Paper text:
Rotavirus, a non-turreted member of the Reoviridae, has a triple-layered capsid that is assembled stepwise in two separate compartments in the infected cell: the virus-induced viroplasm and the endoplasmic reticulum (ER). The icosahedral inner layer of the virus, composed of 120 copies of VP2, is in direct contact with the dsRNA genome and encloses 11 copies of the viral polymerase VP1 and a similar but undetermined number of copies of the capping enzyme VP3.2 The intermediate layer consists of 260 homotrimers of VP6 arranged in a T = 13 lattice on the surface of the inner layer. The outermost protein layer consists of 260 trimers of the glycosylated protein VP7, with the inter-subunit interfaces stabilized by Ca2+ ions 2,3 and 60 trimers of VP4 forming spikes which mediate virus attachment and entry. VP4 is a homotrimer of three chains (A–C) associated in an unusual asymmetric arrangement in the infection competent TLP form.
Author numbering:
A (entry chain A): 494 to 534
B (entry chain A): 583 to 596, 605 to 776
C (entry chain g): 134 to 397
D (entry chain h), E (entry chain f): 266 to 397
F (entry chain G): 51 to 68, 77 to 326
G (entry chain F): 51 to 68, 78 to 326
H (entry chain I): 51 to 65, 78 to 326
I (entry chain H): 58 to 63, 79 to 314
Amino acid sequence: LERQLGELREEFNALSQEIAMSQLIDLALLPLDMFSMFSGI
Amino acid sequence: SIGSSASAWTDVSTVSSVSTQTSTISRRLRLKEMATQTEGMNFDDISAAVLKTKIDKSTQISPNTIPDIVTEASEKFIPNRAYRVINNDDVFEAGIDGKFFAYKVDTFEEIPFDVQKFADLVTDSPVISAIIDFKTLKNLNDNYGISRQQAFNLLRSDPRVLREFINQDNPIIRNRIEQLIMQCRL
Amino acid sequence: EYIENWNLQNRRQRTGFTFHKPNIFPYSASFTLNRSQPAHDNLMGTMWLNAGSEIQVAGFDYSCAINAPANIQQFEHIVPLRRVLTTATITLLPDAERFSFPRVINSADGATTWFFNPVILRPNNVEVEFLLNGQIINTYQARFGTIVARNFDTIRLSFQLMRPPNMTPAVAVLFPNAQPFEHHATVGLTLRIESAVCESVLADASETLLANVTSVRQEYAIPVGPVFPPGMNWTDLITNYSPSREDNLQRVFTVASIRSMLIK
Amino acid sequence: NGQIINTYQARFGTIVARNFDTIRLSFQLMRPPNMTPAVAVLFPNAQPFEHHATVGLTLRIESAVCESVLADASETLLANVTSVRQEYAIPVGPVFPPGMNWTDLITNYSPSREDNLQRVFTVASIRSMLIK
Amino acid sequence: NGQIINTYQARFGTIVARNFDTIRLSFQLMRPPNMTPAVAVLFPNAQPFEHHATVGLTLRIESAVCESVLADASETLLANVTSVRQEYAIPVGPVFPPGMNWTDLITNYSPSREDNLQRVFTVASIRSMLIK
Amino acid sequence: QNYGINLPITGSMDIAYALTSTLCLYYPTEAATEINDNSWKDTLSQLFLTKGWPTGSVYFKEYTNIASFSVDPQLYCDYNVVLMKYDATLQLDMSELADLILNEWLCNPMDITLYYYQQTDEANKWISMGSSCTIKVCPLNTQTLGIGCLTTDATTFEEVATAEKLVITDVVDGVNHKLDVTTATCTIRNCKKLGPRENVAVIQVGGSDILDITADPTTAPQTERMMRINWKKWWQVFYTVVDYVDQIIQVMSKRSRSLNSAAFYYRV
Amino acid sequence: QNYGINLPITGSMDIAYATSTLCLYYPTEAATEINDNSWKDTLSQLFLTKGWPTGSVYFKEYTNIASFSVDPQLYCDYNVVLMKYDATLQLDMSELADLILNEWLCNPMDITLYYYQQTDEANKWISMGSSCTIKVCPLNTQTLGIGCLTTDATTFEEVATAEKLVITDVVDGVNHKLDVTTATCTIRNCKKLGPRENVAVIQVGGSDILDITADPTTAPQTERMMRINWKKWWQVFYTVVDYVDQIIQVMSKRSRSLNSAAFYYRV
Amino acid sequence: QNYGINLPITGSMDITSTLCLYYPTEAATEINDNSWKDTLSQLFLTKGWPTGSVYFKEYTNIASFSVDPQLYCDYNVVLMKYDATLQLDMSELADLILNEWLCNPMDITLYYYQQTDEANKWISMGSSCTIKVCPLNTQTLGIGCLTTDATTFEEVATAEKLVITDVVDGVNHKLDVTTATCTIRNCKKLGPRENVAVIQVGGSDILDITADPTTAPQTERMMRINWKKWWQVFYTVVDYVDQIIQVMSKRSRSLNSAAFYYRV
Amino acid sequence: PITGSMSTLCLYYPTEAATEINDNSWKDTLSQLFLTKGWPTGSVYFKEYTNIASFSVDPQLYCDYNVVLMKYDATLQLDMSELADLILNEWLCNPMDITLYYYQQTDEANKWISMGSSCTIKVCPLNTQTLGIGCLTTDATTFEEVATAEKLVITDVVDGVNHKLDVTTATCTIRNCKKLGPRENVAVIQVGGSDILDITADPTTAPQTERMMRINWKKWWQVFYTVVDYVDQIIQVMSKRS
């Protein structure tokens, strides 16, 4: 189980630079729930 | 109790001594984001947004494994956390980082710090999740214009001033925000 | 200065007597127990000596508060003064150097004695409270060294002994969780008065007034009168300090100062 | 001079002496009349003892007035004395003991040393009033 | 002043006392030597008791003259002080006790507060002749 | 007068200070059988008389075998001294006899045919006294299931003592147990170890010392109320313990439960 | 030391403040009438409902009033004695209630080398054992008996016989001789001191045959002596269960003893 | 991180596991159960231990337990059943299991030897080891024995499964051993071990952990208890385990801190 | 009344070791050993006793330093305590004439000592009026038995009263002795044991003077080596004669 975690770790460690910040804030405005955190996947 | 009237927010249950005092205070204040006593854009907000975009765009995610990902994200994001409190033109700030500041609302010309009014004001009054740290506030004062309106807004961590600052390419706030991002590393 | 305070207590203005290290605390060296065994194999109490211009308090327990709730034992001790003070600059050192060595001390009833072999910890949540007439004026926690009191007359020292969190074996030998105790725990404070300002007359360690008056009363061998207790024992003097005594003491200090510049 | 000019019994705290030239401290140690096991164990008859009984008397002179000049707690003088004596490595003198040792000095206090000390402390008292 | 000033033994009713600051009441409760049929039930010689014996003293200082200032039951100084303080919501001062609570004052009578009393009471009298 | 409400007490270090105490001695048999006299008691009496102690104040109660003396040791007397004849083969019983009669046990009785039980603190023990005790204990997990023993019968538990008259078990705290003895033979009482008892002094005449009173392995102290002397003729042991009986008496103290002021504090 | 006997209490009226064990004793009549084997467990589960955790109630059995009389024992923070009423066992009921409800401190007694006396009014003599027949004699100043010739015992003035337990009171002011049944009983000279709150008595049936002091003037009925009527034992047990809070409220625990004997022997 | 230096530490005055039991076989023989280890595991769970990490090891005789002794476990409580026979063996056994022994090998067919410090001993283990000695003059000549002989030697131990040999120092000695039966390592004691606690059952605490006569240093690790049945001992062990844990510390060599400082 | 301001070594042994070593040259061995250790030749000696109690017969102490090895034996324990008490303090003794006088004690420092060939010790404590207390003054068999056929006896009796004595003057000698203090010039080492020896019959105290050492063993060569290797510590713990 740990292995997928490590792969996703490597992935997340390189998607911290290719993210936007303005849109990040403007997202953080809206509230998230169970329905929009894993049901739009 | 570090201050007066022990309030279950200052015990020692869990650099000089004051730093450690405020640090054991700050790791506790981290959970004030868990109990609905904030007035701005909390840290866990930034954490949640990073989690959102990252778990959406990625390719190795799977419904098999979303659990324990959400958990580790919840309990390792943002290792360096700050907090500030307001009282009558007089604000103070503490964080686990290993520092502590105090200064005045009119002009951000630092005031030497006290740790006994501090604990009282925090444990009762509304706590605002710092999102722009003191380095950044002082600098933004220096090289960029400042309005007392703008200042009330920033100390409030207002959305408008934040986003407008982002859109104006103002580099220091961008660098602070990117530092926050690069903190969310799992 | 002294003629001036005289003319002021004549002119109805706030009087002022400055002093270096005043002997304001009366002499009384006594102890207090909260729990007692007739053989002293289980105790809990306090000791304190208040002499000259300083006080040394020390609260002790044999169990190191193992049976007590949440591994904490409280200690209180209060001292009232018979004359309020002003703008005091107090010094506070956490210890009892006077109560730090094994003693043999006499019981309360007076037939036998008891033992003391304490081992020093540092006191936690030390609170010193300088209250005025039942009103908090100065309160100090989590701090030692030199502190300041603007207007106070009643001192409370409250301190909690905390059984340590975790101990190296040589320590775990010290405080056996079972009943027999083979060493004793103690934490304490010391409070010293360097400089002060008062409304009345007092005895310092830098003026010959008290000295000269006692000496001349002796030399001319005056019998005892109903105001001055016998032998100028400053203890009895300051024990029941009261108006008429105060006035006559101001008088004698004044006239002795008058004498001082010329007599030598 | 052998005359008991001030005498006191077990009085503590503060006292005064009009004048005196020697101090005598006479006390008496008393065996415990009645004791308890905690004491009984550590006060035995046998020859190899563990503990040893003792009684201590302590005295501090606080205020005084004298007719002979001596070095005090507040003086600026003796500092000036020693410093001017050290500044240029003045050769140790025929009468003054080395280094202005207060111990060696008050060891044997002689009338001529007394007058020398008076002169020097006086000129030092003058010295202070000019350069702090 | 640590001395006995005046005595009263077996005198009842009204008395006069010149100058005092402390009262001491020493009194004895006596058992009856003889008891008629009604009493034995009130006092069983054994340890179970129901009714208890008691003796009391009532002590009222009718009138006097004080060398300091005090309130009373026949003047109107305290009431005016308190009212004028109560009305306009004056923030309490650092010296006076809250609400001019008389008992809290008396428990901790201190000379500065005393002189402040005297001042405000003279001022109350001043007001008291003009608009009653 | 004011009892049972523990209020502080002011002493002082300011004033120095310038018969009815009854010794109550016990003794074992083979000593006596070797003494070869019926007046020895009277000789001890007259000696104590010359030492400052009244005649008729000292009494001699005799115990036959150590295991016999283990039952019901109500040692009620102003001051008590127990001389035990040592054994190189009977040790644990001496240790537990010392433990019992030197400490104060406040105990409540049990009915093991019905109730589960469990010890509470490191100061809670189970004393068991009588003729021939054969303890049978069966530990349980959290919902009453046998562990190493079967609860559907009685003879498959784990015994901890056999052929013992007096034994004091200590059990793992915080777990329930099933229990069996013959409740017509001997009795078990659940005692809390309240505080040390000071009425008694036990001295041993024989081999090496073994005495410890704490069932704690780490703390094996040597109190003062436990003394040891050698011997080859019991006469000298008696004579000597009377030669220093002054020091022995000064070591012990009045029983802190019967002092007329220990009222409403557990036995008075 | 003395816990504070000479430093009095200080109190106020202006301040607003707004595992223990319990035993039972029942005569074998109940063990007969019950006719069950699992009953004590039911009683346990019940005292659970009323507030006792499991492992905090124990049961003891005595077969006669006379049997339980010798050498009393107590076993819990609170002792409840359920006494059956009878019409020819009255002095025994009162003697047992006196002994267990009241404190005693006594010295041993002999017949060999002394005479004996009471120094005051509030002292008694207690006799317990297998067979206790007590005969007594007072004297004059002449060391001579009045009503019993000092040398002959058959014409003695007996007070006790055919009995297990006796608490006798003789007159102050004279020595005494006694024909105790020595090897078949035992006697002590006790002083009662004060009441105890570690025992209570519930008398089933009967009409208050009790006195706790032999004083004719004071037959002080207390709040701990309770009396209910019975014709069915389960009703008695239940009804006791229903007011156990009340009974605990009537007793107090700060008076427990260390030994299981309800008195204090001090040679 | 920063090893290999002796770098002074500052401070101030304001601020899984394994429990490991060895037992003699005769015990479990007296027990006649087999699931017992599982029972005591459940009990150690109840006192707070993780399920499935506590190990019990079984030795036939204390002699056997003496040879090839190896403890590798976070917390070791070793029981020993006394006998009035092997007092030397048990003393030197507790010794070998109380210290840190810096050891090097030896070849007694090619050199001489010595003891150079008072913290130096010669330890021997093997099946049937019986060593003989002959001290040597400053001229490398034998006394009461000859390097050519093997029988005029001075016998010091005999078929002892283990022996801790010591002699007067600053002097050479030619020995006699059987190396393909026994090994003798030259060892130096350095400090006390915190991973071991020796509970003796039966006896009177007779240990001596030094060849030093002048003192019998008793410590907080050599505990003693009495027995009438084995489950008695095991219950005392399990219930009282916490104070024992407080006695024995983490292996001061174990922490990744002693690296290149004669780390184990 | 003074104001301040801020060589011969002997090692005794029982015959068991003598037999055990099976040599007749060990003397020179240990000698040269001490030589290398920093002593001069002819400065150390040796003395044998047969058995423990026999050593108590006319004990010889004469040596600048005294180190006594004692072997454990169960059935002679109190007697080993006796020998220790004898050679640990300094006794000063005065004679006793049992067929001519009547003796008391007055001190907790006053003991009775009995040494010699072999004797039995029987005494009766006397009344004030010279009458037999629980025995008869004149009868020799009525008396009470305190020692039977023993090599050394340290008798003590309660003080204040008289005691008529009886022993075999034919074959023993008793001395009324008083202690001055410790015999610092002597030290003792037991083998095995359980710290079962003390210097007082006193029940209150039996504190171990640092002169009573203890060592385990299996063979005597190791024992002698362990002693001699640490002559330094044994030296500093004790002092020289007189």
